[PDB]
């Protein structure tokens, strides 16, 4: 069991998580405790959906589980170390900024493991910098799978409490009655963006102001760009009417490149809404490397 | 998009690792086909009266027959493995599950609270937490994107229920097959069309090949209503699936 593991330090707060040294081989991990509910509920739905679909993926942008510890009143998973995320990353470079080359190499590898996701019929929906990790070397992975799904073609109604405030997707603000992997991409999309101009682009602070805040920048939709948008659920004709402003403002560093990438994967129509793997073709990433940081 | 490519060949590689056993019947001491018929039935009821997914019914399915595949179990017990299975199916697809004391009401006091909290936590270990599984329903809805009669649809899952039932001869065969002989055969029945060009370069599955399977599933239809466990004809009689179970079989398919 657990006789072989030495605690060193706890890093946080699902469940609780440690840093821990095998005694045996040497090797450094993350332990991450779930208690169960042995008298009403039992085992939580979100930890059965974390471990069943982790196990069947395994790709080089994605952190790996390495196992399962039974115990009768507790569950302990075993994760591979990485050394920071990329929250705490961009707070240590406020004052100089992030190197382009940098940039466009952590965008490449992340769009990597999304195609892989749902490839495999799996939908993550939480992605946001402080579930994103990095090592000493230059690479970046996907984590915390505890709020994800498995789909099916077509797909059904799901879920409508997902997705945290800042990086939710308009359809979803409207009260849709069907929604899918664009979700994951307007997610990075907002993502994008934050890592170039040093802070977050929608900081709405209710439901309300959050939908209102991109209103002013993309423009209020119509039937034009955006057909069926005015039988949405929650949908109003006392919208005010803002107009469109120029992405030189939007995101000045950016290029010409960089610039029609971003106005892609921000698009109202999640049907027109670029997928994952046809963004890996675009022109932005013909000089892609691998810097260290 | 792009993907539903990618994911059907997933899927055709899934089937094969989450198959159970075909003659895992025979090594049960105390046990019987017939059985097995009465629990699946009883299960069908317990969908409708607190208005469960399809697809959730078609998963607890495909965990008791892989449990009974690896474990010795009695008569007395063989209700509380399939509560446990219809509880963590729940949990995995619906939107609002029930709650354990419901589990707990429908077995009308036969078991615990306690004895079926258990039984959870055993059915995890011998799966080893593998639960995201292909099933009937999944292929079916990606068949409904080549045709849009409504009422052939009703009739396709109808069908495909059916063979939840009967553990000889459907253990056989694998999911892809018994979804495409059960389309087939609803189109028939309703139109008089066949089995779809897009279909046979798609799944590289021929009218040919299909043809042990659906001489099967024929003969079910037809003495469907003399058969012993009658829970499922009841369901499809409701106006929400058209009343297709009233329908009268073909004769000939030739
Ligand atoms: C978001 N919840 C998480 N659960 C686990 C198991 C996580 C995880 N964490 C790490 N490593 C990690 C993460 C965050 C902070 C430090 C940390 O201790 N420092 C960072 C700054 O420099 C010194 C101290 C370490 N690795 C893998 C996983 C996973 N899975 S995150």
Redesign the pocket.
């Known amino acids: 069991s657990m006789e072989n593991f030495q605690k060193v330090?706890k890093?946080?707060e699902?469940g609780v998580?440690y840093?821990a040294r095998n005694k045996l081989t040497g090797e450094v991990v993350?332990?991450?405790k779930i208690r169960l509910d042995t008298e009403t509920e039992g085992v939580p739905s979100t930890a059965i959906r974390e471990i069943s679909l982790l196990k069947e993926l395994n790709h080089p942008n994605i952190?790996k589980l390495l196992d399962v510890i039974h115990t009768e009143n507790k569950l302990y998973?075993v994760?591979?170390?990485?050394?920071?995320?990329l929250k705490?990353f961009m707070d240590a470079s406020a004052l100089t900024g992030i190197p382009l080359p940098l940039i466009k190499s952590y965008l490449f590898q992340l769009l990597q493991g999304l195609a892989f996701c749902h490839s495999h019929r799996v939908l993550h929906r939480d992605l946001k910098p402080?579930?994103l990790?990095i090592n000493t070397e230059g690479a970046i992975k996907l984590?915390?799978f505890g709020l994800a799904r498995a789909f099916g073609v077509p797909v059904r109604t799901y879920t409508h409490e997902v997705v945290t405030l800042w990086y939710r997707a308009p359809e979803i603000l409207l009260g849709c009655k069907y929604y899918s992997t664009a979700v994951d991409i307007w997610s990075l999309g907002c993502i994008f963006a934050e890592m170039v101009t040093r802070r977050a682009l929608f900081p709405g602070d209710s439901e309300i102001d959050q939908l209102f805040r991109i209103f002013r920048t993309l423009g209020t939709p119509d039937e034009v760009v955006w057909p069926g948008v005015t039988s949405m659920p929650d949908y109003k004709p006392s919208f005010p009417k803002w107009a469109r402003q120029d992405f030189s403002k939007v995101v000045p560093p950016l290029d010409e490149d960089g610039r029609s990438l971003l106005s892609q994967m921000l698009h109202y129509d999640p049907n027109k809404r670029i997928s994952a793997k046809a963004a890996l073709a675009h022109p932005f990433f013909q000089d892609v490397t691998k810097p260290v940081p | 998009p792009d993907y539903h490519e990618d994911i059907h060949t997933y899927l055709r590689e899934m089937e094969v690792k989450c198959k159970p056993k075909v003659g895992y019947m025979k090594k049960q001491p105390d046990i019987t086909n017939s059985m097995r018929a009465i629990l699946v039935d009883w299960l069908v009821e317990v969908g409708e009266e607190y208005k469960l997914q399809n697809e959730t019914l078609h998963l607890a399915v495909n965990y008791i027959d892989r449990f009974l595949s690896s474990m010795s179990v009695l008569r007395g017990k063989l209700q509380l493995v399939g509560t446990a299975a219809m509880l963590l199916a729940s949990k995995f697809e619906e939107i609002y599950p029930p709650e354990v004391a419901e589990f707990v009401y429908i077995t009308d006091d036969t078991y615990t609270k306690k004895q079926v909290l258990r039984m959870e936590h055993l059915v995890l270990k011998v799966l080893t937490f593998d639960l995201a599984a292909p099933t009937v329903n999944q292929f079916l809805t990606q068949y409904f994107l080549h045709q849009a009669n409504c009422k052939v649809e009703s009739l396709a899952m109808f069908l495909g229920e059916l063979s939840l039932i009967d553990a000889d001869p459907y253990l056989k065969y694998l999911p892809s097959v018994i979804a495409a002989a059960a389309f087939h055969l609803a189109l028939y029945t309703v139109t008089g069309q066949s089995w779809p060009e897009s279909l046979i370069r798609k799944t590289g599955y021929t009218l040919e090949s299909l043809k042990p399977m659906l001489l099967d599933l024929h003969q079910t239809y037809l003495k469907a209503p003399q058969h012993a466990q009658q829970s499922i004809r009841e369901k499809y009689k409701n106006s929400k699936y058209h009343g297709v179970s009233l329908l009268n079989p073909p004769e000939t398919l030739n």
Request: aromatic share 12%; glycine share 4%.
């Open positions: 330090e890093i946080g699902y998580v840093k993350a332990l991450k952190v998973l994760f591979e170390f990485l050394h920071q995320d705490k402080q579930n990790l984590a915390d």
